[PDB]
């Protein structure tokens, strides 16, 4: 009878809300800010840790730390602060009356899931809890039962194929190349034009520039020749203190790392080759059904050139007699949370919650038996 | 057949000479001095700009300007004056008969290199020219083919790892903290004892004090307690007009900014953490070979405590089963020029000069294709 | 329960009073006058030292000395006389029953603060004491919590930026150019029209002329051309013995040294460039909040043209899309004392007093740990 909570804890954004809703109620950056100076003015209330948007509005006097890197929680006190801010200050609910659904990237360490279960049952003690795979939630929100999901966020880009409700665990691929690597590469290549960004607040500024101005080129060499020929692709951005910068080919050289990882010195293949290799590792009789049901999700897949480029690359890789379709919904930045709300509101899901007596009987190892 | 010229244009010192020599022939401070008063005595020759040592000998009536800051040329007329003084008054050669080798810091703006190419091909028009990376020249002068070079001069402290003659461009780190920042911090902390230095000549005096008297503490807290306990670390310095000043803990609080940048309000990590992060960003199988081949170069690394402190900090950071060696040659103040002389005298280097017809055909953009 | 005392000891004026009041009760010039002649008339009481206004009313037979120059106390017996006259003859209180709050310029010698603490605890022995920074008190009296304060008095002109109650210690700038230098420059340039002032009483007369008649020109060259064209800017002043002098362009050539220090042979930049450099040394994301909160304080900033000139110069220096606001309250001559009265009356300030047992245990070095 009680409303369940869905909390997608990504590497760069935390999205929390209630089950059965269409959009997440609380979306905030998952950062913890700490002051690096001394407060000489007394009388007003100054805290030691700033969490979320308050860290973003005061980032000029704070050092910002991300508790999650590549889908792995590194700082657990900061992660506890993020969860406390999500439960009490944003959602404004008591966590002991609502079951909570959490997400996790595939091929993750087991200790991350075990400590997540331990913290949810011992610090914010819930009646029930569950850990789900984000690509399965993206396929839940897509409304279909078959397809291969490429989910790319802030730390993890992973491909998961599912045929007729059955997952293929040997064909699941994980690549540690996502939007934070693109932000770092943009910060590296912005020094060619004479712009220097070194701090964490400057990293947030570069992330805003990447969100506002970058796009995926259909043909990389033709666009590089066009940028070298005329200044028609140059765009201007206004800094917070008033300066105006101009960028040219860096609008499309930054998301080209998703298709050419060797720009950042990585031996792995691109996302199109990863998708093709994940399709090739499945059974043959389902492969055509995976060719026409490519589903994109995550904030990294929101560049306004990526669907046509992915379609062209997969059509080049696949045999010519197959139909290639890329499903790119406009709400795919929040599709993991939407699938979490669809899954938690199902009547058949109420019997696979991990309850508190099961955690008391089995310890923090029941999550390896009742989940993926 | 003609002897090439090697000219290392640092942020604080210009070192020029001939290829194949062991030491640079002309080492002079890269400053331009201009008079701030009116010359009331007529008859003798007073000039408008004093370049080099003549600026240092008459600095009490001149305002001194550095044309290079943080390895970036800001004033180009003053840079042209510096190059003219280096070619005609110091080396005493015609620049149109000798190819010239120049150095540059990594992760620099492209317009700097392009304007250097344009100036050396159109004002001091050379048969050939080349731009090299200073840490690669330091590894050339070291005599080995593998290792990670930490080069710290007057504007730039950069780490470059090279394994078996192959550079690792994604692990190259640049930090804008060097000896001029140490001079400014020494000026700031010299006001505690009652000494005031505000002018540019006083900046040169404080730089001389820092060169003569400062050293790197092995343990900062123990040395601070020892300085607070007894006056055994105090040293005396004689000013040019006859006053004698005495300094205590400021002998080791000034180069501590290299290991703790937060003394000058900078969010970056120390040089030891930068070196460790540059090592850990490389491949694993080469990391041991980067642990025993740490090469120091530049005038900033000439403090008489820095090798032991760097060894202790890196040994604390690294796993205990690895061997840590810091290579600190006594001639490392001029090692970039020595490597430039080694490189320019090689028989295999004569085919990668940027010639004048190539500059005429391709304009001032050939330097991005024939160099780093 | 006992009322605290606030005593701002500036280089030219001493302002003392009680905490919780709106205006300082005792404002007197910080001078010590001594007779240079022999008293031939006996019977009446002639003293050896005249302190304060009694030094000003009898300055024709006295040599006047300032115990404080450039915010640094040079004569300690005269400073003890100033403090004794402030406590016993002006405020008429016993100093052993009231805690005392004192002000000090940034980037000052430590021995000044240590001897201030020693004299306050051993000669006028207080229950508690504290040393504060004057620009922080100006921001306290302004009522806001963010902004950059330019405080210019009789010896020190300093810029301190504070964002959200956090100070920026690496961006604090100090320039030794204030109203006494302007008085000396007016004494120098008044000899062009045939007026000679050489003594200390004549220096007080020139200071009165500068306070009554000087103003800051909006455009220096246009005002110089207007003064050379017609005698419309000329003003007349009556000397104490009856002579009438007339001044022209010297009304605005005297405070132009604040913007062009090279008038008195100083290599430093103007106050507008110092403010702009102090803003640009801060973090980027706070810089806009420093552009609209420029706070003026001190008696030197009371010329009736300085706010518009500062606004015009900073607007010329800053990018055009930023808003520049100069806050010039009419009570800014006493704003340091008002902020000291606000700070000493706070309930959260009562736990950071330096008490007498702490001084007894730690000696005169506790003030470096319990203050700025």
């Amino acid at each position: 009878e009680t409303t369940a909570l869905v909390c997608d804890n990504g590497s760069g954004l935390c999205k929390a809300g209630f089950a059965g809703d269409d959009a997440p109620r609380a979306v905030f950056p998952s950062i913890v800010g700490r002051p690096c100076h001394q407060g000489v003015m007394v009388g007003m209330g100054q805290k030691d840790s700033y969490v979320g948007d308050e860290a973003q509005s005061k980032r000029g006097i704070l050092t910002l730390k991300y508790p999650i890197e590549h889908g792995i929680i590194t700082n657990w006190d900061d992660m506890e602060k993020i969860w406390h801010h999500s439960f009490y200050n944003e959602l404004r609910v008591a966590p002991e009356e609502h079951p909570t659904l959490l997400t996790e990237a595939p091929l993750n360490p087991k200790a991350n899931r075990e400590k997540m279960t331990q913290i949810m049952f011992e610090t914010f003690n819930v009646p029930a809890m569950y850990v789900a795979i984000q690509a399965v939630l993206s396929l839940y929100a897509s409304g279909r039962t078959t397809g291969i999901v490429l989910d790319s966020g802030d730390g993890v880009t992973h491909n998961v194929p599912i045929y007729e409700g059955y997952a293929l665990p040997h064909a699941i691929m994980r690549l540690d190349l996502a939007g934070r690597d693109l932000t770092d590469y943009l910060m590296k290549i912005l020094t060619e034009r004479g712009y220097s960004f070194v701090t964490t607040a400057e990293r947030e500024i570069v992330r805003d520039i990447k969100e506002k101005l970058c796009y995926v080129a259909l043909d990389f060499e033709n666009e590089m020749a066009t940028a070298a020929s005329s200044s028609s692709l140059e765009k201007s951005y206004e800094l917070p203190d008033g300066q105006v910068i101009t960028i040219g080919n860096e609008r499309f050289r930054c998301p080209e790392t998703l298709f050419q990882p060797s720009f950042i010195g990585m031996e792995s293949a691109g996302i199109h080759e990863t998708t093709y290799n994940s399709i090739m590792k499945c059974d043959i009789d389902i492969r055509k059904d995976l060719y026409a049901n490519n589903v994109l999700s995550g904030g990294t897949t929101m560049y306004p050139g990526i669907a046509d480029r992915m379609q062209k690359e997969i059509t080049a890789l696949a045999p010519s007699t197959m139909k290639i379709k890329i499903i790119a919904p406009p709400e795919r930045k929040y599709s993991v949370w939407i699938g979490g709300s669809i899954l938690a509101s199902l009547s058949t899901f109420q019997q696979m919650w991990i309850s508190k007596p099961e955690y008391d009987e089995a310890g923090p190892s029941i999550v390896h038996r009742k989940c993926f | 057949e003609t002897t090439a010229l090697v000219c290392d244009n640092g942020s604080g010192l210009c070192k020029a000479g001939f290829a194949g020599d062991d030491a640079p022939r002309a080492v002079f401070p890269s400053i331009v001095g201009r008079p701030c008063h009116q010359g009331v005595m007529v008859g003798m020759g007073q000039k408008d700009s004093y370049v080099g040592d003549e600026a240092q000998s008459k600095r009490g009536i001149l305002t001194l300007k550095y044309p290079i800051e943080h390895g970036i040329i800001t004033n180009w007329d003053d840079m042209e004056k510096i190059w003219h003084h280096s070619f005609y008054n110091e080396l005493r050669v015609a620049p149109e008969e000798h190819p010239t080798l120049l150095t540059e810091a990594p992760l620099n703006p492209k317009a700097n290199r392009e304007k250097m190419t344009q100036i050396m091909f159109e004002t001091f028009n050379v048969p050939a020219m080349y731009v090299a990376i200073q840490a690669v020249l330091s590894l050339y002068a070291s005599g080995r083919t593998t290792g990670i070079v930490l080069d710290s001069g007057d504007g730039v402290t950069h780490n470059v790892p090279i394994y078996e003659g192959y550079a690792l461009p994604h692990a190259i780190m640049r930090l804008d903290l060097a000896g001029r920042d140490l001079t400014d911090y020494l000026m700031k902390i010299l006001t505690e004892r009652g000494y005031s230095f505000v002018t540019t000549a006083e900046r040169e005096i404080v730089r001389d004090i820092k060169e003569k008297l400062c050293y790197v503490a092995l343990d900062f807290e123990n040395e601070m307690a020892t300085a607070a306990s007894s006056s055994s670390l105090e040293k005396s310095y004689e000013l040019p007009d006859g006053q004698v000043i005495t300094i205590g803990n400021e002998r080791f609080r000034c180069p501590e900014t290299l290991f703790q940048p937060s003394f000058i309000g900078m969010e970056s990590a120390g040089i030891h953490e930068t070196t460790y992060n540059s090592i850990m960003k490389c491949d694993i199988d080469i990391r041991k070979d980067l642990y025993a081949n740490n090469v120091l170069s530049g005038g900033t690394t000439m403090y008489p405590g820095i090798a032991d402190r760097m060894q202790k900090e890196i040994t604390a950071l690294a796993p205990s089963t690895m061997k840590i060696k810091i290579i600190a040659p006594p001639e490392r103040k001029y090692s970039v020029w020595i490597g430039g002389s080694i490189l320019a005298s090689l028989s295999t280097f004569q085919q990668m000069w940027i010639s004048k017809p190539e500059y005429d055909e391709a304009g001032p953009s050939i330097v991005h294709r024939k160099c780093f | 329960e006992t009322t605290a005392l606030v005593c701002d000891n500036g280089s030219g004026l001493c302002k003392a009073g009680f905490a919780g009041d709106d205006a300082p009760r005792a404002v007197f010039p910080s001078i010590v006058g001594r007779p240079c002649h022999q008293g031939v008339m006996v019977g009446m009481g002639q003293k050896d030292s005249y302190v304060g206004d009694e030094a000003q009313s009898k300055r024709g037979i006295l040599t006047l000395k300032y115990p404080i120059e450039h915010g640094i106390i040079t004569n300690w017996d005269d400073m003890e006389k100033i403090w004794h006259h402030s406590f016993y003859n002006e405020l008429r209180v016993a100093p052993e029953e009231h805690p005392t709050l004192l002000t000090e310029a940034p980037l000052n010698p430590k021995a000044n603060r240590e001897k201030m603490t020693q004299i306050m605890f051993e000669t006028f022995n207080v229950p508690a004491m504290y040393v504060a920074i004057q620009a922080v008190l100006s921001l306290y009296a302004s009522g806001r919590t963010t902004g950059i304060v330019l405080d210019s008095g009789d010896g020190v002109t300093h810029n301190v930026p504070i964002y959200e109650g956090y100070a920026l210690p690496h961006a604090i700038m100090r320039l030794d150019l204030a109203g006494r230098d302007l008085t000396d420059y007016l004494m120098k340039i008044l000899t062009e029209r045939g007026y000679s002032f050489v003594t200390t009483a004549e220096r007080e007369i020139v200071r009165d002329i500068k306070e009554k008649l000087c103003y800051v020109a909006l455009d220096f060259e246009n005002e110089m051309a207007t003064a050379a064209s017609s005698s419309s800017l000329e003003k007349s002043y009556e000397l104490p013995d009856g002579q009438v002098i007339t001044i022209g362009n010297e009304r605005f050539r005297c405070p132009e040294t604040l913007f062009q220090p090279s008038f008195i042979g100083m290599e430093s930049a103007g106050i507008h460039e110092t403010t702009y450099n102090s803003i640009m040394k801060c973090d980027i994301d706070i810089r806009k909040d420093l552009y609209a909160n420029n706070v003026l304080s001190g008696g030197t900033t009371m010329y009736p043209g300085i706010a518009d000139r500062m606004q015009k110069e900073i607007t010329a220096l800053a990018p055009s899309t930023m808003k520049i606001k100069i806050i010039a309250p009419p009570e800014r001559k006493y704003s340091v004392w008002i902020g000291g009265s606000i700070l000493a009356s706070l309930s959260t300030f009562q736990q950071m007093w330096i008490s007498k047992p702490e001084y007894d245990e730690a000696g005169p070095s506790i003030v470096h740990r319990k203050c700025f």
């Binding site: 220097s196 960004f197 070194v198 400057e202 300066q243 | - | -």
Partner: peptide, 7 residues
């Protein structure tokens, strides 16, 4: 540099 230094 030109946007985040000076130089």
């Amino acid at each position: 540099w030109x946007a985040x230094c000076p130089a």
